Amino acid sequence: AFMPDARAYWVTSDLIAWNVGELEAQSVCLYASRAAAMSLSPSNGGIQGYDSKVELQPESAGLPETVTQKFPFISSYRAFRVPSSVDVASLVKCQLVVASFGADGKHVDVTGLQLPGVLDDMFAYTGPLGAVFSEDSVSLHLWAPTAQGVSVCFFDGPAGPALETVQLKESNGVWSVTGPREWENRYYLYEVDVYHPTKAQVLKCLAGDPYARSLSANGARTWLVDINNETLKPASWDELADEKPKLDSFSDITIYELHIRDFSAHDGTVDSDSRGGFRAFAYQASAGMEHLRKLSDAGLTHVHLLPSFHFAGVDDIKSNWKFVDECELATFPPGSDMQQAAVVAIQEEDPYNWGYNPVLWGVPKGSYASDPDGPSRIIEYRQMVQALNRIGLRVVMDVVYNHLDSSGPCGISSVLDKIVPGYYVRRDTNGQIENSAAMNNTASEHFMVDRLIVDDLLNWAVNYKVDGFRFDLMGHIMKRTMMRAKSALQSLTTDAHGVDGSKIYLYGEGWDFAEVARNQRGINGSQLNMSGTGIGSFNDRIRDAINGGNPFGNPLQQGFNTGLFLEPNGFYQGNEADTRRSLATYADQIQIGLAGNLRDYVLISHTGEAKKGSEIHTFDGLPVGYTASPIETINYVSAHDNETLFDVISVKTPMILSVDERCRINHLASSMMALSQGIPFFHAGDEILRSKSIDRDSYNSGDWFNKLDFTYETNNWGVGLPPSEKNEDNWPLMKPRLENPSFKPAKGHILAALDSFVDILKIRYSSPLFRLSTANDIKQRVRFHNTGPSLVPGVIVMGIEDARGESPEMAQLDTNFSYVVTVFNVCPHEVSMDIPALASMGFELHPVQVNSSDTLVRKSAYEAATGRFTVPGRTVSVFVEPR
Ligand SMILES: [Ca+2]
Ligand SMILES: [Ca+2]
């Protein structure tokens, strides 16, 4: 059910805002009902069922600055004063309406009130929430300022009946009770008597604790556990800070994005109880962990795990899970629609979901634990973090503070909106819930939401020693929330909290759209607003320029690395002159991205004109470069959302290409990330040609379409048409590709891709020149050599200078090399790039490539006489000048 009409706002203890006309409103009245008994029958004409009524006086000047700064979208609203003899604290517990009356008489308008403003003004609370343990006692605190009553129900274990109810007492919107230490390890729920607008009734609801630290299966009950308890800690837990991989600089970060279930779902070297969960990471002897160890040893610093907190959509009870038969599905044709039909038939009841469906942020996901009741979810999550740290990998959590799975009074999956209806969720100007994020958008602009987000971040940092956070839809989060979180986390110390907060890294998707766009709800965490914060955002410009098109465009639109102009695929994209100009535009966008996507980096563009990164624009008119630092740029070409790297290349390149050619194209795309300034971001599987059978949104597509094969025998290409819900419109382009045997790589291709990926990682970490930490360093040191109207199409040449000669004008960063030149050649044929500025130097092919298993790259050459660099087709060559 929709929330009722609520077009007025209660913004402070004394002020109500409502966009009503001057002559349209002679006077305005507020009506309250304790029992939610108000109605408006057209036969009677007047509001009935009210316990009280109070006239509001119009406030000529309007709303104070503190309101309009907080809620800018109502800055134009007329202001109405509530007399100070009105018991506001009692009234917010009631059903409320406001009514307008013409200066001639008779009701002209009636509406409900949106209460967050007044709830913050009067009841913002900074004290303890959830459970607090002392030597002799346990206390519980719940923020529920609109509730008429709150009790706690204690349970006989995770499945047993209620044993005891205890009433809580209210003070300033906060309900609390203190009990004996013996309450420890009980299970509980709050019983909350509250007016729910969606049902127009005061209902008695059972809710979990927003500040839960553990749960029974599916969050049915909250476990009253002391998170600091010694028995919940793996061996050596309190010494993990001493074991954490060194991180000299944020500019040294590389990120690998991985789904916890994908990691081990198909790993036969992992035991059956650990497969698909946290424990499979503590299995150091597996093919999966050996794979991560290999990447980590080559230089990978961070693993970004998909949502791992309490989300909806997967049953925590493993015995409820439904599976397909993989042996059967393997016999269906590669372009058949039967595999997806089988998956879709059980997708609501299978073990699989990305997890972008938040219920409680503070608790590990039960389905990823060996037992969803008791201590295992806590212990095993910690075991995972420890195990990753031990193989040289820091751990990033994908956090999803932008929306909730559910709202309203009904269901196991609604918590926040059950307790304080209408507060935690963002609403439009008619009172309906905003759904632009997916459904049930949160409102970080509200005090207690901001508090819950920051408190949750601190929970993961301190209680689980998490090393970083990726913020889903950061643009839906207020900038002030992001900045306070940054201040709070970065001030944690090993002595006082057990973790070095100064090393915690934050980044997010700064997409600016819908109701939050252009600062409508306040300064939000969009890409542009986050410039100069030290918080990273995904660089979509470099992604689209390399791959071609856009997630919202025609799938056949080519880019720099998918054959635009050079290798036309037959989908019409203009004449030769149009496609060549589009190629050169993408080349400029990529070069800005390679230099850290800085707003003030100056590039010679394809017109021959010198332009700042922010002066170069996208097709839709946005500045390409926007950051103040390379650490604010997350460069990527692939991720869990949209088609994998292998699949996008297979769609966009000409059908006539061999998989051998497409293998090198995959490598070029990952090398562009791996050798860029800023922070490279890799989708798990980039390195082994991972396919999802061209699934563009595999969130609910099961283990079948999301397979990671650490035997390296297959890449999951050609396993049927992907689920129709998200893919059907593109099936006609997918079928002939999936059925064509020359599109499928063999084991030798997959292993070659892996070997080359590891090599390019090693090159990144072979020289500090690839990882400059400031905009000044990049502006002084990084040059592009193939520019202007006469640029060679399909070639990028990037030079990086270090101190050389007697008394140089820069610090010496590299003890081994004095200059580095990278040539990205996406042309099918060999190129010869003459760079006279680099003649008479001691360039050699990088030792890693000299000793490469790839025969082609070993053919690369430099000629000192002319500064000529020769690079084979579809190759990235790195040349170094040894000291
Ligand atoms: Ca490592
Ligand atoms: Ca599912």
Side-chain angles (χ1 to χ4, degrees), residues 296-297 299-301 392-393:
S296 182
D297 288 0
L300 176 69
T301 66
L393 294 167

